[PDB]
Amino acid sequence: SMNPPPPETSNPNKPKRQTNQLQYLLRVVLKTLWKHQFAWPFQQPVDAVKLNLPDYYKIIKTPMDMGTIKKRLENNYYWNAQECIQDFNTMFTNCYIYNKPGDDIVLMAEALEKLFLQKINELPTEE
């Protein structure tokens, strides 16, 4: 039930990078998803104390949220787009893992994933 430390958004011994794809992930992809009607559950780490999910972090061992992702992008925390895309997939996957099909929260994630996949279907080309 106690909340774990949120995932890092900076790390001095991790190399940082800025790429055109990563810029697009923040400017277009993340900030578009953010505004979706179903984004609000995924805009911050899950507060298992607030939401009364004392088993959340007993089940999910790689939490991830769009708020974390947003900070990581603004901080150049990622090396490449694929690293950032993998965080999105972790966030959707966590939601399917902790829940079951048909749940309102899963329908939310399912929709966001389709928009996400639509937006990353075509990324800009590297410079």
Positions in the binding site for ligand 9E3 (CB under 6 A):
41-42, 46, 51, 95, 98-99, 104-105
**Which C-beta is closer to ligand 9E3: that of 57 or that of 79?**
57
The least distance separating ligand 9E3 from the CB of residue 66, rounded to whole angstroms, comes to 10
**Which C-beta is closer to ligand 9E3: that of 9 or that of 23?**
9
The least distance separating ligand 9E3 from the CB of residue 79, rounded to whole angstroms, comes to 26
Q: Which are the contacts of 29, defined by CB distance < 8 A and separation ≥ 6? A: 116, 119, 120
Under 8 Å between Cβ of 74 and 26? yes
Give how far the C-alpha of residue 2 lies from the chain's centroid of Cα atoms, to the nearest Å. Answer: 21
**Which C-beta is closer to ligand 9E3: that of 60 or that of 84?**
60
The least distance separating ligand 9E3 from the CB of residue 85, rounded to whole angstroms, comes to 18
The least distance separating ligand 9E3 from the CB of residue 95, rounded to whole angstroms, comes to 5
Q: Which of 47, 43, 62, 44 is nearest to 3 (CA)?
A: 47
> In a 10 Å sphere around its CB, with 0-12 CB exposed, 13-18 middle and 19+ buried, how is residue 24 labelled?
middle
- Cβ atoms within 10 Å of 56's Cβ, excluding its own: 20
**Closest CB to ligand 9E3: residue number:** 41
**Which C-beta is closer to ligand 9E3: that of 19 or that of 68?**
68
Q: DSSP code of 40? A: G
